[PDB]
């Protein structure tokens, strides 16, 4: 687990053979990480859109460990001010908001 | 309630005597709402910062009802692509992330 929100909900993830930190972000549809090298096929995706779009590489069905939960989901790889775990992967780990 | 994350976590809020919709956004530090007229004193606050800053009006100790829970917290009023309930109010309602 239960994560309270007095601080930013930053968690450790394992991806592409590296340990990274990322923000659990219920306001984000998608997961965006920078400075990871993922194997295999990808397609460009345009994201953002305010002021222009940002082009990223979309990798599908990526194995990722988020806080000890091994799951599978789409990871967008591209520059981002903070690594972000979006709703796409929060559903995979069974993460809910509760009050 | 328990809110799953397959869709965007949009909830009804009551503020400044109006019903509004807003996104429960764990990636946001602050709460930003547009098109609301709040009484009393405020101070400008600079937010954002990438590409420039956006100036908003910061109102403190605002009574707000979020999804049934009557709480008090800072509300920033200004243009926002979508109304956002940030961590500052999620702590007030006792909202946690759980998996």
């Amino acid at each position: 687990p239960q994560i309270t929100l007095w601080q930013r909900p930053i968690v450790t993830i394992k991806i592409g053979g590296q340990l990274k930190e990322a923000l659990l972000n219920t306001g984000a549809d998608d997961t965006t990480l920078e400075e990871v090298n993922l194997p295999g096929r990808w397609k460009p995706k345009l994201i953002g859109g305010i002021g222009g779009f940002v082009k990223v590489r979309q990798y599908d069905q990526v194995p990722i460990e988020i806080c000890g939960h091994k799951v599978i989901g789409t990871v967008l790889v591209g520059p981002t001010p903070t690594n972000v775990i979006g709703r796409n992967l929060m559903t995979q780990i069974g993460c809910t908001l509760n009050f | 309630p328990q809110i799953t994350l397959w869709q965007r976590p949009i909830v009804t809020i009551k503020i400044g005597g109006q019903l509004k919709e807003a996104l429960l956004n764990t990636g946001a530090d602050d709460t930003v709402l547009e098109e609301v007229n709040l009484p009393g004193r405020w101070k400008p606050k600079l937010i954002g910062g990438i590409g420039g800053f956006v100036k908003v009006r910061q109102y403190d100790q605002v009574p707000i009802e979020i999804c049934g829970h009557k709480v008090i917290g800072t509300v920033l009023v200004g243009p926002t692509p979508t109304n956002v309930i940030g961590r500052n109010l999620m702590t007030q309602i006792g909202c946690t992330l759980n998996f």
């Binding site: 923000l23 972000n25 306001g27 984000a28 549809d29 998608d30 995706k45 345009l46 994201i47 953002g48 859109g49 305010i50 903070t82 972000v84 979006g86 | 996104l23 956004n25 990636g27 946001a28 530090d29 602050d30 930003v32 937010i47 954002g48 692509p81 979508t82 956002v84 940030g86």
Partner: peptide, 7 residues
């Protein structure tokens, strides 16, 4: 901070 989304 404050982060949302959009393709």
């Amino acid at each position: 901070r404050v982060l949302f989304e959009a393709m």
